[PDB]
Ligand binder design. Sequence first.
Ligand SMILES: O=C(O)CCCC[C@@H]1SC[C@@H]2NC(=O)N[C@@H]21
Ligand SMILES: O=C(O)CCCC[C@@H]1SC[C@@H]2NC(=O)N[C@@H]21
Lengths: 118, 115, 114, 117
Amino acid sequence: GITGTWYNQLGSTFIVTAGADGALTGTYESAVGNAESRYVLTGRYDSAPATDGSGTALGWTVAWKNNYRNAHSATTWSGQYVGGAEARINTQWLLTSGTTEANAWKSTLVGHDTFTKV
Amino acid sequence: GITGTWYNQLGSTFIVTAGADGALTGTYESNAESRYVLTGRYDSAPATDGSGTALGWTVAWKNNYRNAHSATTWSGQYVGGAEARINTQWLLTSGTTEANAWKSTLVGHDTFTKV
Amino acid sequence: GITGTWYNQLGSTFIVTAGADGALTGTYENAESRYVLTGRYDSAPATDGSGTALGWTVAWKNNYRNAHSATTWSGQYVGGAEARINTQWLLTSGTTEANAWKSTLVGHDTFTKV
Amino acid sequence: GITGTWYNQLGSTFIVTAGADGALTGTYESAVGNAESRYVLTGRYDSAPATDGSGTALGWTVAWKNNYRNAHSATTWSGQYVGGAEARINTQWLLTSGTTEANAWKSTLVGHDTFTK
Ligand SMILES: O=C(O)CCCC[C@@H]1SC[C@@H]2NC(=O)N[C@@H]21
Ligand SMILES: O=C(O)CCCC[C@@H]1SC[C@@H]2NC(=O)N[C@@H]21
């Protein structure tokens, strides 16, 4: 159910596969920031979630370097899948750049993404 | 210099291998009962100008014994030198129902040291 | 633009007055559910269609309840017909040190005038 | 306890007064970023915290406008005061800049400061 192709509000594309032991792998395509083309993502998810109507906790990372570009940045997404009519992944993310120690205070962006398969 | 074992101040320990393909893999020890698979990515080609190396990993807090129905992501950067550290901000997201989704997510920071 | 009554999607409601010198003052909503708010905004935003930087704080104490916590919202006002306040918030509950790593929740809210 | 002069790890100066009512008032001066001289802050704190040795939840905002400069941004600190031989305010902060709709994805920095007497 998590496996498949997803989109967010910004129009990025995130092609995950959810493996057996809570492994998340795929590519990420973002509509924004220092980034063109596909980046490798990997993460993890809760492979044994709750029956009680609770969602499925997951997260992934993307290092924004590929064969064409290196932003010297990395983003992590934290959130939960929710199945149903409109299945969706509500996330919060943290994007950190490689900064000198004098710029580390301003090294990290925070934001939230919502993914859907539409 | 990311490869190796790292300690935070909370008593948590992580062992990670920094692969040549920007891969970050290892275990997180929050007692095998407490070890969790870690997976992430890092800037395999950092600047040499005094910048740290951006990185992120994730841990889903399920293993063969427990499941907290949650996941933590770390996003931060490796800083070399004789006093090396990984400085991070994390997001802990819990499995909740929709009416509880506002209370799904803890934020924090950790520093990691080679010790 | 900001001054007035804002509603989020959780039904919850706040009324604020932005004073000329970036003050934000109002209440966050049932008497028992009303709390004092205070914040600050950029009283002189760019004129480039950037929104208006602002934030505020609610400590969750009133004469009826005390949750021993504070929420702060950091976001920006985006005016016009359909105005929105898009925020991010940190909720921190007083904790012992031992539990301080789990002291602070994060999320986001979007408040509208309707 | 909370009332006083505070500094963070950045060499920033946080000068705050806590009201009986739960109001925070004061001035912040940051060592870093698009800032010089003092800025107005306002906040709230729990004016009747727990008895369990829990910290005092609190928060404040600085919109970064003063007569010297304007960064079109606001930082919200959220945290707790911790009494003791080493009084300390541990916080997480959100710095949101006014951005266009297009750049809103990168409007908000997150970070953490701890303030010492
Ligand atoms: O460093 C860069 O400029 C590249 C960052 C990638 C864009 C971010 S990651 C969080 C958010 N979600 C997206 O789909 N895009 C942005
Ligand atoms: O937008 C700007 O450049 C002004 C922001 C002020 C710098 C920040 S606020 C969070 C952090 N704590 C400090 O003492 N300084 C920085």
